[PDB]
Design a binder for this molecule. Structure first.
Ligand code: CA
Ligand code: CL
Length: 302
């Protein structure tokens, strides 16, 4: 009997008529709006990734890396950028899904043993934050954040999140002020991970919210976002990420598989990977693998 619509996938908490159908956000389906529509996907917590090697600004050395039969690369894009003391990388960030806090993850790889580094991140906005926006509380101190890279890691979560808004273009500047050990550092990318625990499905006061919050933290579901590799999560994480993603993105996103590079318009509904032709890479199968050429109907060749 009970409605029990999806807290994330449906608009109202109760069903209509005697069909038991809920009102769904865009491209969520099922009687309770609990399923992603074929042709659409729920994004991974690290969907919003900007490659260091795609960055504008001062000329920096690109360090390419080849995929080996080992599979499971530890980087994305062609590889990395080598950043030395005093140099800066500019990430041009646009098209964010929602006005909320994002945690900043810097993915990197050291060049000497026991390597540490000191960094400064500055958020540059296209105007003053408005009093009526969810980011209206932001002040200048909130938009400059220091971070330290520690030995034996490949990702840093900066110690404070940033509040960013949809429909706007930002420039996030990353400066390396010092690095040593006992040729600089390699930077892979910057990831903007939505801080989904602030959503009411978790942060609310009701018993149902407290349970979701407890489960999310116990199984550390937020770790999906840390690295390119995706190791299977506890099954308990799955419906929580489906619901949280629907609330961030307003339902599910269209796959947008590249017509030439993909075998199909239909991508994986968890994370959105398209099925690539030989020699093709990228979520949308829209680039040649490194060392391959000739993007077209057949794929790419070495
Ligand atoms: Ca990269
Ligand atoms: Cl993408």
């Amino acid at each position: 009997r009970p409605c029990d619509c999806d807290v994330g996938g449906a608009l109202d908490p109760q069903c209509d008529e005697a069909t038991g159908q809920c009102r769904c956000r865009p491209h969520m389906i099922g009687r309770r709006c609990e399923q992603v529509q074929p042709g659409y996907f729920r994004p991974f917590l690290d969907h919003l990734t900007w490659e260091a090697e795609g960055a504008h600004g001062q000329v920096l050395e690109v360090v390419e890396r080849l995929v080996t039969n080992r599979e499971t690369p530890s980087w994305t894009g062609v590889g990395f950028v080598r950043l030395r003391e005093g140099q800066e990388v500019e990430f041009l960030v646009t098209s964010l899904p929602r006005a909320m806090d994002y945690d900043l993850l810097l993915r990197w790889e050291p060049q000497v043993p026991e390597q540490w580094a000191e960094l400064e991140l500055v958020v540059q906005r296209p105007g003053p934050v408005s009093a009526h926006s969810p980011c209206g509380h932001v002040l200048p101190r909130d938009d400059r954040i220091q971070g330290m890279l520690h030995p034996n890691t490949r990702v840093l979560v900066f110690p404070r999140p940033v509040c960013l808004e949809p429909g706007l273009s930002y420039k996030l500047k990353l400066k390396l002020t010092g690095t040593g050990g006992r040729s600089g550092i390699l930077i892979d990318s910057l990831v903007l991970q939505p801080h989904v625990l602030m959503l009411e499905m978790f942060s609310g006061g009701d018993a149902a919210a407290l349970e979701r919050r407890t489960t999310f933290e116990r199984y550390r579901c937020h770790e999906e976002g840390l690295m390119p590799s995706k190791t299977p999560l506890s099954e308990a994480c799955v419906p929580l990420l489906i619901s949280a993603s629907s609330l961030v993105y307003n339902g599910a996103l269209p796959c947008q598989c590249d017509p030439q590079g993909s075998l199909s318009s239909e991508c994986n509904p968890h994370g959105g990977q398209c099925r690539c032709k030989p020699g093709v890479v990228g979520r949308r199968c829209d680039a040649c693998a490194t060392g391959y050429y000739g993007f077209g109907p057949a794929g790419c060749q070495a």
